[PDB]
């Protein structure tokens, strides 16, 4: 810090969020840095009375933490490199705009719609790196569409994982795992090709420490966080959590009502010839040991009939704790994991 009015990253991000992230005033140049801050946000293991819980740890040494209760009251704490512990309660209607701007799932009588601030796929991947940080509406359970009901639940995890890793956006404890690094991880699990499953060593003891370390070395984050990661991977449950995350059938409750518009979109697109979907995943282990997976699949979608010719992104969230003591084993994962499913639609302004 070199100036009294110089804010930590944590503080900068928080002010922007409550003021409104879509507030028109922004300088575009501000909009760019604002997104670059918003992506440090990570959903983590919530507690008894929390809708969801967000955590951001910046490079400057600041930390933003935010809890949203079931009744929707927000508590944010900001820490800084100089040990200030700023705290703020939003219990009136002050959290009004803030709720739209977080990795949380809300009870909502219709599907949440957002706006950006989309030709090629570099574009498509960034749009989801944005919406994976916005809010989603919860999809109520139905037996006909829960991937975890029916015949062969979790049958594709290893295949889905094998082909997912190298192509995903992926965070472990807020440390980004780049494509090269994911590939090492895939190997480290024993996933050579489309039809292999994981070596029983990994299933019983997580990744080896030797691999766990190189993988971190090759990723992007703080030394403290890389160390958090290495410990995470040397755990059986990291296996469960990583593989479960890639389970494509998580998209089914979301696709049930949207699949027709998703088609119109590949069609509307096909007259221009291309991929449709991408992945963005955050996994976190709380300091108390708890594993949480938030899994995102971004997908191109046509808007409803009222706005023809507009294409946006359906963003599907799948969220769950992976309870200590659950190895990566279908019949096991099936009775232990309890995914919760939410979506959002984002469209471009103009």
């Amino acid at each position: 810090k070199k100036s009294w009015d110089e804010m930590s990253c944590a503080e900068k991000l928080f002010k922007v969020l409550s003021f409104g992230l879509w507030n028109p005033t922004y300088s575009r140049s501000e909009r760019q840095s604002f997104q670059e801050l918003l992506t440090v946000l990570e959903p983590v293991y919530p507690l008894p009375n929390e809708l969801g819980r967000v955590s951001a740890r910046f490079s400057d040494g600041s930390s933003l933490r935010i809890s949203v209760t079931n009744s929707e009251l927000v508590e944010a704490e900001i820490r800084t490199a100089n040990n200030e512990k700023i705290t703020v309660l939003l219990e009136s209607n002050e959290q009004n705009r803030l709720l739209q701007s977080l990795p949380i799932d809300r009870h909502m009588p219709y599907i949440q719609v957002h706006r950006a601030l989309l030709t090629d796929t570099t574009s498509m991947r960034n749009l989801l790196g944005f919406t994976s940080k916005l809010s989603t509406t919860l999809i109520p359970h139905n037996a006909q569409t829960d991937p975890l009901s029916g015949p062969t639940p979790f049958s594709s995890i290893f295949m889905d994982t094998c082909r997912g890793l190298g192509n995903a956006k992926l965070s472990l404890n807020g440390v980004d795992i780049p494509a090269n690094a994911q590939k090492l991880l895939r190997d480290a699990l024993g996933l050579k090709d489309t039809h292999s499953s994981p070596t029983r060593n990994v299933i019983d003891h997580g990744i080896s420490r030797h691999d766990a370390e190189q993988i971190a070395r090759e990723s992007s984050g703080s030394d403290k966080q890389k160390a958090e990661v290495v410990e995470f991977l040397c755990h059986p449950e990291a296996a469960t959590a990583i593989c479960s995350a890639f389970y494509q059938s998580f998209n089914v409750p979301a696709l049930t009502l949207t699949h027709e518009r998703i088609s119109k979109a590949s069609e509307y697109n096909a007259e221009r010839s291309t991929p449709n979907a991408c992945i963005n995943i955050s996994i976190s282990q709380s300091s108390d040991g708890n594993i949480y997976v938030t899994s995102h699949t971004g997908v191109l979608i046509m808007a409803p009939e009222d706005r023809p010719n507009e294409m946006g992104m359906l963003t599907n969230r799948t969220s769950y704790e992976v309870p200590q003591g659950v190895k990566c084993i279908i019949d096991e994962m099936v009775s232990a994991l309890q995914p919760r499913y939410a979506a959002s639609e984002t469209y471009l302004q103009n």
Binding site: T121, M124, N167, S249, V252, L255, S266, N276, T297
Partner: peptide
Amino acid sequence: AVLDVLKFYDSNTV
């Protein structure tokens, strides 16, 4: 059936 509408991005494309 419904997953058939998804076409996942792949690094290996120019």
